[PDB]
Amino acid sequence: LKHSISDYTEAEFLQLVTTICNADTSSEEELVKLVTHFEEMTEHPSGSDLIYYPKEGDDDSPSGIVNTVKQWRAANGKSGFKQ
Amino acid sequence: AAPVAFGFPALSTPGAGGLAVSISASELSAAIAGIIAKLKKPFGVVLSSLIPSEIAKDDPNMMSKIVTSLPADDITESPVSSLPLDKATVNVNVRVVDDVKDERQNISVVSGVPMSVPVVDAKPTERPGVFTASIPGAPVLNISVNDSTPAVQTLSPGVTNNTDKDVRPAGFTQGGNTRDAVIRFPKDSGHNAVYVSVSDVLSPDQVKQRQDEENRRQQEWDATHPVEAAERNCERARAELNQANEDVARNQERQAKAVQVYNSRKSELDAANKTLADAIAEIKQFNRFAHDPMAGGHRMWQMAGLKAQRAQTDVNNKQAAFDAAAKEKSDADAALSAAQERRKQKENKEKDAKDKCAMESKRNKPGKATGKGKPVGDKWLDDAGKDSGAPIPDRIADKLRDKEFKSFDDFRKAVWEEVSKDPELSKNLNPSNKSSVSKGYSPFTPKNQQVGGRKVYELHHDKPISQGGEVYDMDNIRVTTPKRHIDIHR
């Protein structure tokens, strides 16, 4: 129901990343569906690693990841959040 | 504005003012209700198949979409009325979705999982009883209710109506060119909420693409669900056999039928050949009178002339027919040999399949864990992407051995649960990853070890389950990253 990261508000996107980090799912198949979806929204090169294999000194808590995506996308000429 | 029946896919060429659709009030036919009832107790049923070749004869530009519509209450468990105005998405029990199966794009009624769709309100317009729903990603869908004219089902050379309403499994890519929504009207209109899906008509190039993508996703799912990938083949290999057997039967009919026709035509000839011999003797008889034109006999002779050319033409006709029958009989005899050779191959296929279906069925039946495993280091999960993968760790083997597991699926869940609690094996897992291991699920790999949808560490076996290799034997088992395993087998 969401084809671009610009369909998400910052607070909406945060929820998805807090769902994924806590593994708040009914199945591993719906988790992996969420992560595969997250990846596409970010368009980020690290990919899934933003969540499970962060760089040194990055913040991997739900928010810090929203924060990494945010400033990366902005800094490489990409659309932002809703609003 | 003759209204289109609910649940009967039709082309709507758009305008600048959006698509034009005209619904009815009259409730959906026995047919579709049937389907939704049948389907109630991801799979689905095909309403229509699309043929771009034809759709373009009338819509050369390929601007036309395919609209299909249902009254919302038949879809949704919670009446649309008794729903908050804040909700943008109501849950639905079925949807109408484009699927790609057997090399045509096709519109179909889907089900069997949790689904939920956009809900959009319909602004009115100058015209009386005519509103504008705008579903994200479709054109402006301007609707028009009509319970005056009797309902119609529109018929377009492109859109066919596939009778076979068997429930089949559905596309992985289902919906990839569809936009639907339950649309509600404003309260002082008295019009029921209506469901509408609007799908693109894919061109054949685009269909081959979906088809391709559909086949690739099927591969994945097949390797990550051995339990029942095999249990699927056993159906295909049994169906192919049951079909091939009938082939023998129908051939036998033709060949047993060709044997009588042969025999019949053969005797028809024989008879006709005696008749010639008789007539040709009768001409020898009166041969005498051949040059005496004024004798009794020179009539009786001429008469035998005729008897013979007649009897002769007859033979020629019985011969063609006999030859022809002889041909048919020979071809038929080969048709069984060929057709019955096919059954022998199909009967071998169905054995191989059914043997594998029971060995791959073991990994879904109870057993006790066994083996010792092997020592490991800090780079345990790192090793799962090198060599022949990392093995089960000794320390893990010890904690698990002799325990009883309802299914190998449970044995994996458990292996990870002993990895989450071990600080040195679990040294490589992050807080977000640890949330998954202790929730059962298999932990995620690094990007560079992922492949499409296989993003997590896998348990495989050395001596495979399909070659009778022990399901629960931990000396057998190997942890591998998706990429690593893929590489290992090439």
Residue numbers in the entry:
A (entry chain E): 3 to 85
B (entry chain A): 85 to 125, 132 to 580
Can you provide the manuscript's text about this entry?
Notwithstanding this diversity colicins invariably have a similar domain arrangement, where a central receptor-binding (R) domain is flanked by an N-terminal translocation (T) domain and a C-terminal cytotoxic (C) domain. E-type colicins parasitize the vitamin B12 receptor, BtuB, as their primary receptor in the outer membrane and the Tol-Pal complex in the periplasm. The catalytic centre of most colicin and pyocin DNases is the HNH/ββα-Me motif, a 34-amino acid motif containing invariant histidine residues, which chelates a single divalent metal ion that catalyzes phosphodiester bond hydrolysis. DNase-specific Im proteins are small acidic inhibitors that bind to an exosite and inhibit colicin or pyocin activity indirectly by blocking substrate-binding.
We therefore switched to using a disulphided form of ColE9 in which Tyr324 and Leu447 in the R-domain were mutated to cysteine, which has been reported previously. We obtained X-ray diffracting crystals of this disulphide locked form of the ColE9–Im9 complex in the P21 space group, and the structure was refined to a resolution of 3.2 Å. The asymmetric unit contains four ColE9–Im9 complexes, two pairs of molecules related by non-crystallographic two-fold symmetry. The final model of the ColE9–Im9 complex contains 488 residues of ColE9 (85–580) and 83 residues of Im9 (3–85). In the present structure, however, no additional electron density was observed in the HNH motif, suggesting that no metal ion is bound within the catalytic centre. The result of these differences is that the DNase domain of ColE9 is rotated ∼90° away from the T-domain relative to ColE3, which is emphasized by the 12 Å movement of equivalent Cα atoms in the structural superposition of the two colicins.
